[PDB]
Design a protein around this ligand. Structure first.
Ligand SMILES: CCCCCCCCCCCCCCCCCC(=O)OC[C@H](COP(=O)([O-])OCC(O)COP(=O)([O-])OC[C@@H](COC(=O)CCCCCCCCCCCCCCCCC)OC(=O)CCCCCCCCCCCCCCCCC)OC(=O)CCCCCCCCCCCCCCCCC
Ligand SMILES: CCCCCCCCCCCCCCCCCC(=O)OC[C@H](COP(=O)([O-])OCC[N+](C)(C)C)OC(=O)CCCCCCCCCCCCCCCCC
Ligand SMILES: CCCCCCCCCCCCCCCCCC(=O)OC[C@H](COP(=O)(O)OCCN)OC(=O)CCCCCCCCCCCCCCCCC
Ligand SMILES: CCCCCCCCCCCCCCCCCC(=O)OC[C@H](COP(=O)(O)OCCN)OC(=O)CCCCCCCCCCCCCCCCC
Ligand SMILES: CCCCCCCCCCCCCCCCCC(=O)OC[C@H](COP(=O)(O)OCCN)OC(=O)CCCCCCCCCCCCCCCCC
Ligand SMILES: CCCCCCCCCCCCCCCCCC(=O)OC[C@H](COP(=O)(O)OCCN)OC(=O)CCCCCCCCCCCCCCCCC
Ligand SMILES: CCCCCCCCCCCCCCCCCC(=O)OC[C@H](COP(=O)(O)OCCN)OC(=O)CCCCCCCCCCCCCCCCC
Ligand SMILES: CCCCCCCCCCCCCCCCCC(=O)OC[C@H](COP(=O)(O)OCCN)OC(=O)CCCCCCCCCCCCCCCCC
Ligand SMILES: CCCCCCCCCCCC(=O)OC[C@H](COP(=O)(O)OCC[N+](C)(C)C)OC(=O)CCCCCCCCCCC
Ligand SMILES: CCCCCCCCCCCC(=O)OC[C@H](COP(=O)(O)OCC[N+](C)(C)C)OC(=O)CCCCCCCCCCC
Ligand SMILES: [Zn+2]
Lengths: 88, 174, 99, 606, 57, 18, 459
């Protein structure tokens, strides 16, 4: 509706851009595959806030049955691209 | 001409004259002249062309007239032939009375609109004439039911004649 | 099985063998002629010419006559000072009460 | 006169041309929305000429151009009324509709069915003119029921949305109850006055008008969404924003108020009806104004604002000021429509986010919508010399200096205070503060359709009341002398509202905790009327239709008492007369019994 | 073809049209037997025209 | 939605105005 | 009336002598001509009816019913072409013969001048109607529906036979014109209380009166589309047309004998209107709707005022086209999903854009949206019942609200929302179906322009 269509790069850039502004992750090591729990030592209670910082970025709720399953900033990118009908 | 003014009375007209006491032009005055040239005359000319065609092929149609025939009271019991005609005549008259009530209703409605805010006093005669015709119509045609007939209306008149007569005996008792 | 019976037959789609089908018949030739009679007689003849016929009925149930007739009776009675509508439907001179 | 008549009917015919030209497809699509807008534009200017003729000479007429039906003594003809109310209201309806449609060409640009949407908007506009122009009840009822359907079709526009169908059918339900009152009015007039035309009804001037007037009041209740039949209007916001601005803000909900205005020659002499109408509006103008103080959805706040304004219109009819109630309709059309367009402009910018809690910082971002939004709020609250001042303040003046119910008078004044609260709530939560909307948002409002459509109403919401006020012919004795404390009640009441509203907003920003209360949850939940009634009443009636009406009677007891018992009896007797062994020894003994019985009990032998 | 296979499979299209004509015909015959009161009612009785012999058929 | 001037969107910035 | 009786009979040779593949074309085309010629029946007068001969007569009440009768047979042939496609050629022709025979008995029922001739033809419509239900229904319950249909009608018709013969013995004639002038008042006694009941019970079962309506939800639901259309459109109007004629000779006893029946009808409106709210079956929702619309007609006839009679005649015509149109619309969905459940197929507006417009027009006419002729017919009844008793406005108004619900509920449930995922045989609408709906609504909406031709003899 007159808005700019999303892009795979756009989703990835913004997703990491939110993480870069969180004080409990080091931007130096932050890669797409940096598992939030094992590779960054973040408790699940932090992961909940991580997701909540995303759905407030893209402005669309993510059901709890699936949000807890996302444990990689690539999975978030794949999840949104799959739920927003983006292919290129 | 267009309609009969005896049955549809129209009061005389009284229009004030234009008495401007200002300086700006009046758009209504200009529009009317604009309206006539662009609408009235073009409309009239087409009507005149159509009108001239009729004069060349004039022809007439007539209003039907029914001669009076013996009513119900003049027919013997179980006499279909005499009751049949006496019944049709009742029905044709019933339709006419319905339209008479319609005509008087129109006068009442026309007066109320014409008078505007003076309709409470200046439409007294029409309101008074509306009441009388309805009283007559209501008396001779109300409460007959779906299967109304000349027999039933007569059986209603004869019932009301008794009521009026019985009033006289008590009224003419002092 | 309990008997020898044919399986529940499948339903046949009328567009596969004639994508221009009007839904009337398998044969395209007959199919097209069914649409013509229904549309022509159904719409062109009955609705249109019937509505035109109904529109110009000759004074259906003589209501125009009643209005035209009523005006005279108002014209005549008002001029002569007679009541606009009498309150008695029949003349009492030929009616005899029971007592 | 020949010009007054011709230009009056061409206005109605013009609006119908796009419908006729869409029946035989004698046009080019993809220009239809602009085609409809032009017809409304031209319809407006034509309607002005009769209006000027009325303003100038005070000329009115009635046109009965067709004879449709004649039920014995009743004659039904297609009639049109061109008088104070008809001539004044039509230009405003076209002017606001003109702006709404142009906005729709922007708001609904991406909608696939934008062609059908415009046709439905035009259809409603036609029916609303039938309602307003009707001269007889039957012709009035055609428009009355027509708008209700066009409301049903436009509310349920996104028919895939389960909640749109529920809201759409809900609107029909509540109005249908109102129609019960309308029918009662029609039935009473026929049996008692033998007519439906308003010309004959006023001429006879019935004295015992309590029954028909109660019927009309009930009809006005449902259509104008007063208390008891209020809930549907706040739920009508399921439809697209352009629908909300036109139908349920300015030119459909007023139909209930309009109906009671046309019957002022009766109600003026019936103080009992004036008592009920005054009280019915007073509770609504306060209860609905109370509900808006806590609503978050931006449209619902304006929706409740509409209900409060409608209630105030009914109070005016209740206090026997029919023309002031009408004058509030005309003025209310301008600024109330603008707020919806301004709100709709905000909603599209933030990608269909209607919650004020997720807006903010838009004072500088959207200057044109900001200025339009501000101008509308000041008109609504009754800022002096704007459109809303020339009608709302005259209403408050007439209430205090009148023989009016004390409690109803108090509710009107309290409700006026709440007018400045939720209005400030929208301004404070939508323009000031800091942004709360998402990070990536395209706040753009530069489309010329949006500016020009609003820029036409912004002019109206400033000088609309000023012009109409100084031009309408006088019809009363205005009460211009009174105590100072009454003459300036609204100003003090309204200004105190802003101050009281202002402080409440600031205390939010403090870092204190939040304590829920029984007054915040009462106003937030609409007073509990929808939560209870929309669950209790459907449950009772729907259960009865199944347990009692359907299963208990039709499937059980109507079968048992005739088809079944009669059938069962024959089967029983069929076994008796056929349970025969087949023995000669027992058949012939019966013959012996029959012969003996034929002579002893029955004496067949003599 | 020609007057063959276009009349063997289309002659049916006169059955209903012929039925209307045949049905319409009998109605006129029925009226001729109900002429007892022709020009004899107390509402339409009049004098025959020089060339007219019966008021209606 | 369609027509008029065009404003490129911005990210976490005050929107561009005319 | 031979100008319409003989052509109808000739449709039987036409069907049997036609080509194998042109039975529908000839019958559909030629039966529309018979419908076209029916407009000559409009030669009515303000004081007298059309008295063709000693047997048949036509007036302003029978004329609109005849035109509706001869107009449906073309529509019943159009509707049947689908489910009879895979059927023996001879059987496909007997079915058409049953429809032709049924119309033959109807055009003589509404024109019969002598009441015994009315009774035989009024009673003869059972055979072709019964055969259609049982032979060409699609369910196991058609056999039981024909028994309920047959014995409900006969159980009330046979007492009527005794009454009419009794009247002839004590009057000398059952010719309707004679009874208009030889009618004598009905004194209040136990003997007459069982002559009033005998005369009226036969027709009130066929209206049907509430309580005696258990056969209708079986017959209409189980019959084929062709049977449902005539059953709901024209056969119910035999009962109403019968009461409008038999009531002539039941005064002044009809004024107090109507109380048990008016009360049943006034309350039965809400009972049957409410049943439609909780109906799982789409075709059964329409069937119950018919009982609620005929409840008004019973009430109008029993109060006997010209407005009620004018309104009653209009409801019969208005409901005839509306009820038949709904059955065709509901049947069109059935021919795809082959199930009568209402909730099975939803969101059909996204799949059938045009078929969803007829649902809108069919529903808006069902709920009496002005100025349609449903509202005109329903308004005059309410106006006349108010004069009967002001309290009735409560029941009439209450039924209006519920009617607005079960009509738009039907529209919303099937035409709005998400489509059923597992249904994928929703082929577009055939030209046959669209023309079939246009032939219902367009005549129904045109009559709004000239309503006087359906306002009965009291106009
Ligand atoms: C003798 C010589 C002449 C020959 C005579 C022969 C006569 C034979 C009959 C011929 C008549 C023409 C028949 C149709 C021809 C085919 C047209 C065509 O091709 O269609 C293409 C057309 C466009 O193509 P499309 O875009 O693909 O549409 C497909 C979509 O599915 C579409 O979906 P949709 O949702 O967008 O639209 C569906 C539906 C509309 O959907 C809805 O809107 C539902 C709600 C509608 C009712 C709500 C209002 C209720 C109140 C009505 C008040 C009217 C009475 C007022 C009285 C007092 C004031 C006067 O369609 C309509 O009905 C459109 C019209 C709406 C009603 C308009 C009434 C107001 C117009 C102004 C009237 C005044 C004219 C004055 C002229 C001067 C006098 C001469 O589509 C269709 O219309 C298909 C449906 C056809 C229905 C035809 C029946 C129309 C009946 C009107 C609606 C019912 C009104 C009820 C009151 C009745 C009052 C009488
Ligand atoms: C929107 C339309 C705009 C208005 C159009 C202006 C013309 C107009 O409306 O009036 C002209 C007329 C009436 O207008 P009018 O009567 O005021 O004037 C006509 C001309 N003069 C003045 C001479 C009388 O409309 C009609 O009469 C329409 C007739 C409809 C015919 C109905 C039957 C058609 C279906 C065939 C039967 C099959 C169905 C069976 C159903 C049962 C039937 C009993
Ligand atoms: C006097 C007026 C009333 C009488 C009108 C006659 C009835 C209307 C005509 C019948 C309807 C039209 C029709 O039936 O068309 C049939 C005919 C085509 O039939 P046919 O040649 O057999 O081609 C198909 C081969 N399978 O089509 C034609 O040849 C034409
Ligand atoms: C109470 C509520 C009302 C409910 C109404 C129901 C819905 C109806 C839908 C709206 C219809 C609007 C009709 C407006 C046009 C009027 C129709 C008409 O023209 O009829 C002919 C007209 C009037 O004739 P009239 O004698 O009054 O009709 C008697 C019927 N019983 O007399 C005439 O001869 C005028 C026609 C000739 C002039 C035409 C000139 C223009 C022709 C070219 C353009 C086409
Ligand atoms: C009853 C009864 O007692 O009838 C008495 C009857 C009186 O005679 P009376 O009234 O003078 O007749 C002259 C009429 N002008 O004189 C009579 O006895 C005539 C009546 C004879 C009664 C016959 C009883 C048998 C009929 C009842 C059958 C019930 C069904 C049973 C079938 C088997 C069921 C499985
Ligand atoms: C005004 C009128 C208002 C009053 C109307 C009242 C309603 C009419 C009466 C109900 C009519 C009967 C409804 C249909 C009955 C039925 O269908 O029952 C079926 C039942 C099933 O059994 P069956 O068919 O034999 O087994 C094979 C099934 N596959 O079959 C059976 O169990 C046997 C049923 C036999 C009885 C039915 C036939 C008689 C019906 C008329 C009543 C008879 C006259 C009364 C008795 C006279 C006095 C002795
Ligand atoms: C549930 C089942 C309910 C069954 C109830 C059965 C009711 C039986 C009533 C017997 C009929 C009464 C009767 O005999 O008729 C009354 C009267 C007899 O006396 P009569 O000799 O005719 O005096 C005048 C002669 N010039 O003669 C007359 O006045 C004529 C009466 C003829 C009426 C039709 C035949 C009798 C009534 C039929 C049954 C009525 C109940 C219908 C209910 C249908 C359901
Ligand atoms: C599943 C079955 C469904 C079908 C049901 C069948 C229909 C019901 C049966 C028909 C009943 C007819 C009544 C016959 C009994 C005799 C009536 C009678 O004789 O009443 C005479 C009385 C005299 O009238 P009066 O008030 O004095 O004023 C004028 C006097 N010249 O006038 C009166 O008393 C007033 C009128 C009679 C009283 C009516 C009482 C009706 C009560 C409500 C009944 C509702 C239906 C019940 C069905 C349940 C099953
Ligand atoms: C006639 C007429 O006027 O004939 C015009 C029309 C045909 O019209 P068409 O030109 O074939 O267009 C319509 C067809 N389409 C859309 C495929 C091009 O006839 C008919 O359908 C008449 C039906 C056949 C029987 C007619 C018997 C008349 C006696
Ligand atoms: C009489 C007093 C009128 C003052 C109204 C007012 O000031 O009401 C303001 C209040 C709430 O204020 P809020 O800004 O929503 O704060 C809410 C808390 N938050 C900001 C932390 C979320 O509304 C109400 O619950 C009033 C409803 C009851 C009205 C009277 C009954
Ligand atoms: Zn099928």
């Amino acid at each position: 509706s007159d808005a700019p269509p999303l892009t795979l790069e756009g989703i990835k850039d913004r997703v990491l851009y939110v993480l870069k502004l969180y004080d409990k992750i080091d931007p130096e090591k932050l890669s797409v595959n940096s598992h939030f729990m094992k590779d960054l030592g973040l408790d699940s209670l932090d992961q909940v806030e991580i997701i909540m910082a995303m759905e407030d970025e893209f402005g669309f709720e993510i059901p709890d049955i699936d949000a807890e399953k996302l444990m990689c900033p690539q999975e978030i990118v794949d999840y949104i691209a799959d739920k927003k009908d983006v292919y290129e | 001409d267009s309609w009969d003014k005896d049955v549809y009375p129209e009061p005389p007209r009284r229009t004030p004259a234009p008495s401007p006491q200002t300086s700006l032009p009046n758009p209504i005055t200009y529009l009317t002249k604009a309206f006539d040239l662009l609408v009235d005359r073009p409309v009239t000319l087409v009507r005149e062309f159509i009108e001239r065609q009729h004069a060349k092929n004039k022809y007439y149609y007539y209003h039907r007239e029914f001669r009076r025939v013996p009513d119900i009271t003049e027919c013997q019991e179980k006499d279909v032939l005499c009751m049949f005609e006496a019944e049709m005549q009742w029905r044709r008259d019933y339709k006419v009375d319905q339209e008479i009530v319609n005509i008087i209703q129109e006068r009442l409605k026309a007066c109320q609109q014409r008078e505007g805010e003076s309709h409470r006093q200046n439409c007294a005669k029409e309101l008074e004439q509306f009441t009388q015709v309805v009283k007559a119509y209501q008396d001779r045609y109300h409460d007959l039911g779906a299967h109304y007939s000349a027999r039933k209306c007569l059986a209603k008149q004869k019932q009301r004649m008794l009521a009026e007569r019985k009033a006289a005996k008590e009224a003419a008792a002092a | 099985l309990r008997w020898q019976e044919d399986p529940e037959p499948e339903d046949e789609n009328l567009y596969e063998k004639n994508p221009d089908s009007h839904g009337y018949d398998k044969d395209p030739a007959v199919d097209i002629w069914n649409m013509r009679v229904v549309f022509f007689f159904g719409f062109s003849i009955v609705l249109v010419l019937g509505s035109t016929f109904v529109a110009y009925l000759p004074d259906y149930r003589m209501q125009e006559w009643a209005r035209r007739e009523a005006e005279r009776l108002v014209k005549y009675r008002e001029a002569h000072g007679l009541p606009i509508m009498e309150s008695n439907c029949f003349d009492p001179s030929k009616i005899q009460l029971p007592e | 006169m020949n010009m007054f008549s011709s230009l009056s009917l061409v206005t109605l015919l013009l609006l119908t041309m796009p419908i006729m030209m869409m029946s035989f497809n004698t046009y080019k699509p993809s220009n239809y929305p602009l085609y409809v807008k032009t017809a409304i534009s031209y319809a407006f200017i034509t309607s002005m000429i009769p209006t000027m003729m009325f303003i100038h000479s005070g000329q009115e007429l009635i046109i009965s151009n067709w004879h449709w039906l004649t039920i014995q003594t009743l004659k039904l003809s297609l009639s049109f009324k061109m008088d104070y109310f008809s001539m004044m209201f039509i230009p405003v309806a076209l002017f606001v509709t003109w702006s709404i449609m142009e906005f729709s060409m922007w708001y609904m640009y991406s909608d696939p069915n934008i062609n059908k949407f415009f046709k439905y908007l035009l259809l409603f506009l036609i029916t609303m003119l039938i309602l307003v122009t009707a001269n007889n009840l039957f012709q009035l009822f055609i428009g009355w029921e027509g708008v209700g359907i066009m409301s049903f079709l436009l509310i349920g526009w996104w028919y895939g949305r389960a909640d749109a169908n529920t809201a759409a059918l809900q609107a029909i339900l509540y109005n249908r109850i109102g129609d019960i009152g309308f029918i009662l009015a029609m039935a009473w007039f026929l049996t008692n006055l033998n007519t439906w035309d308003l010309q004959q009804i006023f001429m006879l001037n019935p004295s015992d008008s309590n029954m028909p007037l109660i019927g009309l009041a009930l009809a006005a209740t449902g259509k104008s969404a007063q208390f008891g039949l209020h809930p549907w209007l706040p739920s009508a916001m399921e439809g697209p924003t352009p629908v909300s601005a036109l139908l349920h803000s300015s030119t459909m909900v007023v139909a209930g108020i309009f109906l009671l205005i046309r019957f002022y020659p009766l109600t003026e002499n019936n103080k009992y009806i004036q008592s009920i109408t005054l009280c019915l509006g007073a509770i609504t103008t306060l209860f609905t104004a109370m509900c808006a103080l806590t609503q978050n959805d931006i449209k619902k706040i304006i929706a409740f604002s509409t209900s409060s304004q409608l209630g105030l219109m009914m109070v005016t009819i209740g206090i026997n000021q029919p023309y002031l109630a009408f004058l509030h309709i005309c003025t209310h059309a301008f600024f109330k429509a603008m707020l919806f367009m301004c709100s709709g402009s905000i909603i599209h910018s933030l990608n269909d986010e209607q919650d004020i809690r997720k807006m903010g910082g838009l004072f500088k971002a959207m200057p044109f919508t900001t200025t339009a939004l501000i101008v509308g709020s000041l008109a609504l609250t009754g800022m002096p010399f704007l459109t809303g001042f020339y009608s709302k303040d005259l209403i408050i003046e007439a209430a205090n200096t009148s023989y009016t119910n004390a409690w109803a008078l108090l509710m009107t004044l309290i409700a006026t205070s709440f007018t400045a609260i939720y209005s400030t709530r929208i301004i404070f939560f939508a323009l000031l503060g800091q942004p709360r909307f998402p990070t990536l948002v395209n706040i753009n409002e530069n489309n010329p359709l949006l500016i020009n459509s609003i820029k036409r109403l912004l002019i109206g919401s400033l000088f609309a009341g000023y012009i109409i006020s100084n031009n309408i012919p006088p019809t009363t004795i205005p009460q211009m002398t009174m105590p100072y404390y009454l003459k300036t009640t609204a100003l003090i009441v309204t200004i105190l509202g802003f101050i009281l509203a202002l402080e409440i907003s600031n205390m939010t920003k403090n870092l204190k905790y939040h304590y829920p209360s029984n007054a915040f949850k009462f106003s937030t939940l609409l007073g509990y009327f929808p939560t209870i009634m929309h669950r209790l009443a459907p449950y009772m009636n729907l259960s009865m239709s199944q347990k009692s009406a359907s299963s208990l009677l039709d499937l059980i007891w109507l079968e048992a008492i005739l088809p079944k018992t009669i059938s069962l009896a024959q089967m029983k007797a069929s076994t008796l007369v056929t349970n025969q062994k087949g023995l000669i020894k027992l058949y012939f003994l019966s013959f012996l019994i029959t012969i003996l019985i034929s002579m002893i009990l029955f004496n067949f032998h003599e | 073809m020609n007057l063959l296979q276009v009349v063997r499979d289309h002659w049916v299209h006169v059955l209903v049209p012929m039925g209307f004509v045949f049905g319409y015909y009998l109605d006129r015959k029925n009226d001729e037997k109900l002429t007892a009161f022709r020009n004899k009612s107390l509402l339409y009785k009049r004098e025959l025209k020089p060339n007219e012999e019966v008021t209606w058929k | 939605a369609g027509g008029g001037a065009h404003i490129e969107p911005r990210y976490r910035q005050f929107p561009q105005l005319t | 009336m031979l100008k319409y009786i003989i052509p109808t009979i000739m449709l039987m040779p036409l069907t049997w002598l036609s080509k194998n593949n042109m039975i529908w074309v000839n019958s559909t085309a030629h039966s529309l001509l018979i419908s076209f010629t029916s407009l000559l029946l409009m030669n009515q007068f303000g004081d007298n009816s059309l008295n063709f001969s000693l047997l048949f007569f036509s007036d302003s009440l029978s004329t609109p019913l005849l035109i509706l009768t001869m107009w449906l047979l073309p529509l019943m042939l159009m509707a049947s072409q689908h489910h009879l496609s895979k059927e023996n050629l001879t059987r496909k022709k007997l079915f058409i013969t049953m429809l032709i025979s049924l119309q033959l008995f109807l055009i003589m029922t509404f024109t019969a001048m002598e009441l015994i001739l009315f009774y035989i033809l009024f009673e003869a419509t059972l055979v072709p109607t019964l055969i259609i239900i049982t032979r060409w229904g699609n369910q196991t319950e058609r056999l039981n529906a024909g028994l309920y249909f047959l014995f409900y009608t006969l159980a009330g018709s046979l007492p009527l036979l005794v009454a009419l013969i009794y009247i002839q013995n004590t009057v000398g004639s059952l010719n309707f014109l004679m009874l208009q002038y030889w009618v004598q008042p009905v004194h209040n006694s136990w003997s007459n209380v069982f002559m009033w009941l005998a005369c009226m019970m036969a027709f009130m079962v066929k209206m049907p009166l509430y309580g005696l309506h258990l056969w209708l939800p079986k017959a209409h639901v189980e019959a084929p589309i062709a049977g449902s259309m005539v059953l709901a459109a024209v056969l119910l109007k035999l009962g109403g047309y019968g009461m409008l004629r038999i009531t002539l000779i039941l005064n002044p006893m009809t004024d107090f004998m109507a109380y048990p029946f008016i009360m049943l009808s006034l309350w039965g409106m809400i009972m049957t209107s409410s049943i439609c709210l909780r109906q799982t079956d789409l075709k059964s929702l329409i069937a119950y709707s018919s009982v609620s619309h005929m409840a008004l007609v019973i009430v109008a006839i029993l109060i006997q005022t010209p407005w009620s009679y004018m309104g009653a005649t209009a409801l019969m015509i208005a409901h005839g086209l509306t009820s038949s149109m709904l059955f065709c619309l509901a049947n069109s969905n059935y021919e795809r999903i082959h199930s009568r459940t209402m909730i099975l197929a939803r969101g059909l507006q996204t799949l059938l854009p045009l078929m969803a417009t007829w649902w809108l027009l069919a529903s808006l006419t069902n709920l009496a949206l002005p100025p349609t002729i449903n509202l005109i017919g329903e308004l005059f009844v309410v106006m006349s019942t108010f004069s009967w008793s002001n309290i009735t406005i409560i029941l009439m108004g209450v039924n209006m609200v519920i009617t607005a619900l079960y009509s738009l509920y039907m529209l919303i449930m099937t035409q709005r929302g998400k489509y059923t995922y597992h249904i994928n045989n929703i082929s577009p609408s055939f030209t046959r179906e669209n023309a079939l709906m246009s032939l219902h609504i367009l005549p129904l909406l045109l009559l709004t322009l000239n309503p006087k031709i359906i306002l009965g003899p009291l106009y």
